[PDB]
Ligand binder design. Structure first.
Ligand SMILES: NCc1ccccc1
Ligand SMILES: [Ca+2]
Ligand SMILES: [Cl-]
Length: 223
């Protein structure tokens, strides 16, 4: 997260860290045994880390659970990043409490202008590399489809939306991928891609979760 602020220990209870010897992507807990993340975060040997704040120190409240299965959307395209969504099933159910809780799936899509909370342990610098120890937060509005498509001509599909600031300075970045975009208590987006980080006229692009609610529920129901 570039231009964000320290969230505060366990203030984003649904945030998860995907780990394989190091943090490589974020995710969101949607129920005691399932996590939603980005398809481009897929890899084998994933350990899901819940209740995390400082990812480099065991502080208490953490729950480490191996992924039993990762389900990349069958229509995921790695070149266009369309359908950039993945479901991860935990080997065992997480213990839900005030520090580890699930986030609700949307019943409807969010409109432009809606303020959302984006979080992650991604890069905090636009020009350079600097990874934080503690979870960073960022409040950012969903942009109009017109502005989004003008920023990325011919690259925005109906399954994506832009969020952030056109003047640059605040954005999601590498390492934040797969993380949550929560608006009004509902998971509306998944950190997916963009051109650089916090650059002028190049807002972050996110997977539009409201288009996948039926797919998520039907997939979870059969696994
Ligand atoms: N600034 C958007 C973004 C998100 C994840 C990775 C790279 C860039
Ligand atoms: Ca920790
Ligand atoms: Cl059905």
């Amino acid at each position: 997260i570039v231009g964000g602020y320290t969230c505060g220990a366990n203030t984003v209870p649904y945030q998860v860290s995907l780990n394989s010897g190091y943090h490589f992507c974020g995710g969101s807990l949607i129920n005691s045994q399932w996590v939603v993340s980005a398809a481009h975060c897929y890899k084998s040997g994933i350990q899901v880390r819940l209740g995390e704040d400082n990812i480099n120190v065991v502080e208490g409240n953490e729950q480490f659970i191996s992924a039993s299965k990762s389900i990349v959307h069958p229509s995921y395209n790695s070149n266009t990043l369309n359908n950039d969504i993945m479901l991860i099933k935990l080997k065992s159910a997480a213990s839900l409490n005030s520090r580890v809780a699930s986030i609700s799936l949307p019943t409807s899509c969010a409109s432009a202008g809606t303020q959302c909370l984006i979080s992650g342990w991604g890069n905090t610098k636009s020009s350079g590399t600097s990874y934080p120890d503690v979870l960073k937060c960022l409040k950012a509005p969903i942009l109009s489809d017109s502005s989004c498509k003008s920023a990325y001509p011919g690259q925005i599909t109906s399954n994506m939306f832009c969020a952030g600031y056109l003047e640059g300075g605040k954005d999601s970045c590498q390492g934040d991928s797969g993380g949550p975009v929560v608006c009004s208590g509902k998971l509306q987006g998944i950190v997916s891609w963009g051109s650089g980080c916090a650059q002028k006229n190049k807002p972050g692009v996110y997977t539009k979760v409201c288009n996948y609610v039926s797919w998520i529920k039907q997939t979870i129901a059969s696994n």
